[PDB]
Structure formats: C-alpha cells, structure tokens
Write a protein that binds this ligand. Sequence first.
Ligand SMILES: [Mg+2]
Ligand SMILES: [Mg+2]
Lengths: 193, 142, 43, 56, 136, 99, 216
Amino acid sequence: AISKNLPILKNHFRKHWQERVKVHFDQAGKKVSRRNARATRAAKIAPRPLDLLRPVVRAPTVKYNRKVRAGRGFTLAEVKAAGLTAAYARTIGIAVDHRRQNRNQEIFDANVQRLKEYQSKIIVFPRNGKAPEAEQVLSAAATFPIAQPATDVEARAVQDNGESAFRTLRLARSEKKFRGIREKRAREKAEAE
Amino acid sequence: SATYPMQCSALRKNGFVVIKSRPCKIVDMSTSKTGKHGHAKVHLVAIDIFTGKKLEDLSPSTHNMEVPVVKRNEYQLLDIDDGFLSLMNMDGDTKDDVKAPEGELGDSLQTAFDEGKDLMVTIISAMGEEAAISFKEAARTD
Amino acid sequence: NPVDHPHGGGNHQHIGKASTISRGAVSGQKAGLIAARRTGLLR
Amino acid sequence: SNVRGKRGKLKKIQKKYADQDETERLLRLEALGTLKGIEKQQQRKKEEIMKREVRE
Amino acid sequence: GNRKRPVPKGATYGKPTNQGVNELKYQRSLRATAEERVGRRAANLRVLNSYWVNQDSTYKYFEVILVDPQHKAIRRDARYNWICDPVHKHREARGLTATGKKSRGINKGHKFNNTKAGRRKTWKRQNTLSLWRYRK
Amino acid sequence: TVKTGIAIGLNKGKKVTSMTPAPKISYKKGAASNRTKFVRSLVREIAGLSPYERRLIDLIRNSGEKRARKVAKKRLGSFTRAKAKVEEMNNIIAASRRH
Amino acid sequence: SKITSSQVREHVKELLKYSNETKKRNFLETVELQVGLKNYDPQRDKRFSGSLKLPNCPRPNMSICIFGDAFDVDRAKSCGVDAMSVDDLKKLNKNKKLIKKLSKKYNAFIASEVLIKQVPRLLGPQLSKAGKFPTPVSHNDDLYGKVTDVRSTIKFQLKKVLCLAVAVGNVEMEEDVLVNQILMSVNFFVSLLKKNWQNVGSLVVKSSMGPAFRLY
RNA sequence: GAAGACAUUGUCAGGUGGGGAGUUUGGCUGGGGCGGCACAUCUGUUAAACGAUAACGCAGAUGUCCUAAGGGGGGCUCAUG
RNA sequence: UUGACAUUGUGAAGAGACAUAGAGGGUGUAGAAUAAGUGGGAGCUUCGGCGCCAGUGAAAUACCACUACCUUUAUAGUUUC
RNA sequence: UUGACCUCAAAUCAGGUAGGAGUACCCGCUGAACUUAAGCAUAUCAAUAAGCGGAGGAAAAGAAACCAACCGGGAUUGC
Ligand SMILES: [Mg+2]
Ligand SMILES: [Mg+2]
C-alpha cells in the first residue's frame, strides 16, 4: 500500500467507472456537422446575420470587473433611449433583456451608441414587396466588436502630496475594523445622562 | 478515583467487587472451562455489604471487573437520636450524617446505649454511601 | 434439536431455562406454561 | 388516590374485575397470596410499635 | 402515515444501518400517489393538478383535475391543446405535475445543487470520465 | 453611498456616475390594496377567531404580552410572526373594547 | 449569586439606621441571618454540616468554658476564661440537674485532645442533645486565640427543621465589614448546600430588637 | 341491537424483546490447550575485560511514596564493642 | 406494552395542585400556666410590669423574627385528576 | 296531479380512448450485498445491480421566490 517517498495520490476510481467512459472520437465529425448546421441555418435565414446584437456590459466579480464583455440583451431603458420599442427591436434583430438594470451611465451610453450604429448599419426590408437582396454578412459580433474602454492616457505629470498610499489603505482598514465599536461608545456616551 | 479495575482471576475470596453498580463482597468463586479448547469462565457469588442481597455474575477469566474502594473507620458514639448516630473522630471531629442501623445490630446498639456502655462503632465507606456494620466496647480507657 | 424448539438439544433431555413463559413474550418463545400464576400439584 | 402509581392499578380493576363479588375476590387474593403480604405488613407495623414498648 | 418496509417478519438481511423497518418515509407525497391512482383509474384522461380538501387521522383527501385529450374542445382551444401532445402521457407517473416537481426537487438555487436538472442526470454528469483525442 | 475610489474600507469601489433606474413593479408585491383590505376585514368579521387566537386574547388579558409572545412563538413558526400576531391581537382587544 | 452587593449595602443601611439612630437599645444588638431551605428533605438527603471563622468577631463577650488539664487550666488562668478540671468533672458525678445547669450556663465549650475521649464518659450525651459539644484544643495552640476563633465561629448543620439561623455580627461594626461578613456567610451556606442557589428558600437579615428585611 | 367521544387508527417517546439480524470472541509459546508474561520497563549476572548480544536462562523489582523524604545554610557523627 | 398529541364533538358535578391578598391554630407527664420548633436575647417596659438568677422540664419562659405543618376565605386567576 | 333542479344509475345507446411489445439513451419509485477499511459495526461499494411505474426522437430542464456583494451579472442545457 503505502511505499517509498511519493506524494499522496487521490484517484477516485472505486466505483464502476468503466461503465461511464466518454471518449470523444466524434470531435472532428461533430465539428463538421456543426459547420453544416451553421451553413444550412444561414441559408434558411439567407439575408439575416445568424446572431443577434448583444450589449456591452461589465463583468461581475472583483476578479473580472476590470474587463468588459457581451451581455444577454439590451435594457428596456436602453432601447427606449435608442428610440424603438422592445417588440420591434426583437423583430429587427436586437436582443432585449427585461431583467437587467442601468446603474452605470457609461455602460448606458455605450449601449445606446451601439444601438445607434446598428440602426445606421442595417437595412430593413418592406414586408410585402421588392426584397432588394443585400449579400449577408454572418456575424453582427464581428461587425460590431466589443472594445475595452481606454481608462487613462499614457503620460502625465507627477502629482505627489505626501500620503504614500499605504498609510491610506491601512487607515481605511483600521476605521472599517473599529467602526461599530466607536458608534457603540458614542451611543453609551450620549445616553450617559 | 473512587473505583479501580481488576482481573477476574486476580480477584479472590473476601474481596470487594462492583456488581450491577453495587459494592459487593465475594463469598464464592468457581472456574469452569468453557469448552475443551476454550478459556475457563469465572462464576462469582457475592453479597452486597449494605443491603445483604446475593448477587452472582459469570464472566471470562481474562475480562476486567470493576472494584470499589472500601474504607473502614473507627468512631465513638455521642448520641443516638431520631435514627441518626452522632460520632466523634480522633482529633475531636464530629459527624452526625450517619443513619442508625435498622436491624438487630441497631437494636443491640440502642439497648447498649440505653444501658450506658461506651460503644466503638465501625462505619464503612464505599462508592459514596455510608453505613455502620459493627460495635464493640472499649476494654480500657474507660 | 435446538433448531426446532426452545426445549430441544442437550446431552440429556431437559428443558434448560424455566418453563414458565411471560405473557409479554413473542411468537416462537411462547412454548411451555404461558403466564403461570403458580405451578405444581396442589394438595 | 392522589399518590403516585395508583391510577395505573385502578384502570386494571375497571378493565377486568368490574363484574366480581366479594367471595370470589377473597378466594382469588387468597389463591394469589397477596393477603399474606398484607397480613405481614400490618404485623411489621405491630412489632414496630411493640419494640418501642419493650424499650420503655 | 409512514411506509412500512415490506419484509417478512422485519428481517432485512444486511448491515445494521439498513435494519430500520418502522420509521421509514416514502419519498413521494400522498398527493402524488393519489393522483397516480386516479390516472390509473382513468388512463384515457390527463392529470393536470390536485388539491387538498380534507383530512382525518386515517385518510388524506384530494381532488384531482383531469382533462380529456380526445374531446374537440381541448383538441381546439390553443391554450390547452398542448396536453394532447404524446410527451404528456402520465405526467403524474413521471413526476411532471406540481407536487411531482416539488418532490423531485426541481428548483433554481444553491439549495438544489443535487437535484436541479435531474438527480441521476447530474450524478452521471459528474461521475462520467471524459477523455479527448488529444489528452488534456 | 458613493464609493471612495480605493480597494478596501467602508465604501470601497470605483466611483462611477449613477443612474437610479426606474422602480420595478414586482418590488411592490406585498403591498395591500383597498379591495383586499375590504375583503380581509369582511371575512375576519364573518369568521371570527381561531382557538389559539382566543387563548392568546386571554393571555394578553391575564398573563401579559411576554407570555403571549412565548406561546405564539411556540404556536406559529418564528418570533417575527409571533410579534406580528400579538400586535394584531392587541389591536383586536382595543377594537372590541371600543365596541 | 442571585443576591447583589448593592442590595446588601442598601438593606444594611436601613438596618443600621433603625438600630442605631431611631430606636437605640441599651444591650448591644447582634445582626442575625435567618435562612430557610427549599425542596430539601432531612430524612433522605445528606445532612450538611460546616463551619467558618469570620475575620471580625460577632460576639466578643459570650460565655465560654474550657474543660482542661493541668497545663490547660494554668494557661486558662492567664486567658481569664472559666475552667473546671478533670477532678471537678469527676466531682460532678453525672448528675443531670447540675450538668443541665452547666449546659444552660455556657454556650460554648473547649476541651483538650487528651480529655475529649472521656468528656462523654464523665458527662454523657446531653451535650450532643443540646448541640453544644466541646471543641478540641491542643498544647501547641493558643487558648485565647481559639476562644476568639470559637467566638467567631459560624456553623450550619441541617438537623430536622429546614430553617437555620446564625449571628453574622454586631450592629456597632462598620458597614463594609457587615456587608462582607453577610456575603461570605451566604456564600458558605450555598457552598455547603447541594444544587446551590436554587435550594435557598429565603434569606432574612435582622438586627436584635429589629424588623426583618428580606434578601430574596 | 351494543358501545361511544373511550376503544380503533396515525406519529413520536419509554420499557420489554436470542423470536430474529449482523458481527466479534488478542499475541508469545520446544504443536495447540491449561499455566506463565519472557507483551511497556529497572538492578545484578549469563556476556566471552570498548559497545552490542539470545532462550518460557538465573536472582529480584515497577504502575507507588514524599510540602518534605524538594532547595539553601549551620552544627554534629554512624553500626558495633 | 405504556404515555403524549391528533382523530375529538356536545353537557354537568366532585376533589387536588400552584400564583399572590389576607386570616386564625398547635394540651403525654412534670412545670404558675396549652412547650409546633429553631435562632437572637439580658434587659425590654405600654403596666413599672414582664423576663433574667430560680423552680420544673429533653426542650423555659420577657422582648424579637424565621421556618415548616394545619385549618381558612377571594380572584374575569392558572390549572390537573 | 304535472313540470323542473340536484345527485346517483342503466343500456350490444352515438362516437372515442387505455392496456401489450420494445427499453441503448430518458423521468421517477424501491433497493442490496460481495468489496475496501489489511479485523469490524458508522462509512465505502452506492444514492449502484436486481425489482416496479411512465415517455420520445430525444427526454428532462427552462424564462429566477437565481447568482452575487462587484464599476454587478441575467432562462435552461452541454464542453
Ligand atoms: Mg435442552
Ligand atoms: Mg403506508
């Protein structure tokens, strides 16, 4: 069992694991059928660009809030500011998310601008007549790329005023740590007659 | 501790054991082989010191049985009132917590105290309960 | 044989335990004198 | 009838000894031997008084 | 009440962790077994829902709503003709009614990680060994 | 409630200009309407009191709100529901005393 | 402790206010603690008995007799305490009326280690019946020191009645001393008592010729 | 007709329960069993004049005791004849 | 097998236990007397009387409180049988 | 007397529908032990095998009584 100087292994193979073994032999064929499905879908929706327009949106956690990415759909407030109803936007190819909110003006303005450029770039056909054929592109995401915002300029002047940025962090942590005991002492000082 | 373990074969006659959480004193020990190949079993017959009941247990010989600590202590009577003896220790300590005996020992002790002998009382402690077992008279130091 | 009855077995034919059985005994145990108030021949 | 563990006995008499007469009651308690126990308890009370009388 | 384990004379023939007979509980609800018996009684109908009406010490009383998928008023009336699709045969037997999904544990959230897409489906998904062509 | 600009502390986080979005109607689900208030008052008049509510009325009358809240916490699930139940029963006592 | 020091301080304050200023008495008034214990049985439960020595004496002048040997009587001449010798006890000749008179004469008795054996044989069991039994003293120890000790003794013994009483101290002592002595006596009582602070029926503080004051 | 809000039934809780279930039932060892402990230790010897060194080798011992029977200082000299 | 809760509704009586409001009560003999016990107490006094020394009695007597055990009335009482 | 209503029936009444098979995959119920722990009872094997009920070309799940604690994300499924 235990033997020479080796690391302790944890290999979870004490069930009937050979009954559930999935070997992906069909990677290449599955990729080929996936491309076939994309091509037949594009031929079925032959003018339309195979994917909806997605908003730019800020990634959730503190690990990833430095980056911006694509969302599910646009806010109703965003599409009302763009100047078209949610039902009409869904019919002309704009993803609408009824359950996200706008708390950030920069993200709101970016999504409104993105909707303005989409409405400038598309051609909407009449529902009855001529259908003036227009040589589809296949990726609204590639025609409207998601761009990371420029946060600063690359050269500035040094503005130093003596706080060292370590004392500031330490004092902020200390006042958060000793917040509630200070209002407890303040409350008992106030109710001390 | 109040009680300490022991082995059944280490036990012998006129020794104290714990049987069914009672302090007991052995009167009989008998060992018989279980099977020809097997170890012998010890059959123990003992008497409770306080109540006088007969309790028996059989066990493997290698098994460990619980054994109490029994202390016998010597005192002089002061008074017998309301069924509670009052005793007097060497160095002058006094206890009244002992209840008087209820049997023929208690009757003989009551008559002896009524007719006025100086009575020497032996009381035993085992597992937190206290009783009086015997009384004599002081032949000297009257 | 002891597989067949509580009284079975042994190198002599004998009962072993007491033959008076509790009323609270279970099926397979009630073999003997069930809930006997007294036993023996009275005179 | 307000001391502990008496109503548990009183349930059984209503259950199984409701239809009974005193001849049968005396016969059954004499055949079960409880009457001797009652007699010896009252006797033990008698020597409890008697030993005090002999002491006096 | 509970479900007594149907073993002869209480003998389970195993380890002492499985010797319980009396205090074992059925994993589905009395509402579920009620509507399942109603569906077996009327197999030509489809069970929609059920609700409690009454109870006593011995019985619990439910009323079961059923819809006839052959009647033309349900063949038409597009609000209800989804019940005529053959994937809805014996929803109460597959646990697809409201109390069936409640007993299967089908709910969103961190409290339902074992039972969210199906307990056995998730168990197979996280007990599968996945090997690719170019081994990672 | 503005952020401070630094990574730790009381109001840590980046300062961005806020928007204060329009309130969702689902945030007012538990709000009482006039029509349901009228219905609840009428059915309370029609049905009266449950037995545990009656014995709670006796507990505010005799043994006080602390014992009333203890019994209502045993009867209902939580202390919050017990406090609300004792408060509304005290309202029923005041209204019946006015009656 | 259910009883609090500030409440003890308060009750001691009106107690000394009544005893000293409003109705002064010519005899010196002893402060008494009268206790009653609850959910307890003298017949079945163990009969607790214990003693503590207070730092400042409750009764400086209470009568004490020293049964003693030659050395004990010679020291008792220096101590100024009443004594009868073994020859005197033999004189007494176990006469009940005179020994009852002695028992009502002296509240406390101090006896030597040697003679404490035959103190019951010369005197009999009426001392144990009264509850005044002689306390042992040795040649090494100081008799007057142990007279001060016995005069400062506080004893709790169960007996048969479920209510006890001791004398905490005088009225004339200082307030902090009285508070400290009553607190340590209550603590000693609950230390002797099993299942402490819950088998306490009632605690009463009083002064001699004074009304009762109830501490829980 | 009888019985009656008691039985019954449901769920918990205490007792009883080899009727039944599952499992266990040391080691060393001139075979095993009984006996013993050579199973954790200590002194002398075997032990072959560094150290190490076996046997169910020999002669014994341990599961405690001590607020002094620990620490420091001073004075004195013991068994025996 | 025993207990609780539910099934479980409708009516009358009789007991018991607590909360806190208050009342009265205690006779072997001896001893001036009716001694429930404890603990303090040598002075308290309202009478200048009662205790104390002293009598008897296991237990002693004024003047204080406490604790049991009894009987005893009442509550928009709390409850159990 | 007559005519309703409610509830419950009967018809070889008019028209329909269910059962059984298959079961690799799917949705549930029920449910072990061998084995591992160098013994063994919790544990493990395993929420598996066997048993039972019910579908489709997929099924199931699915448009938050969600995740989060951030400058917040946004049905389900799968990698
Ligand atoms: Mg036999
Ligand atoms: Mg069942």
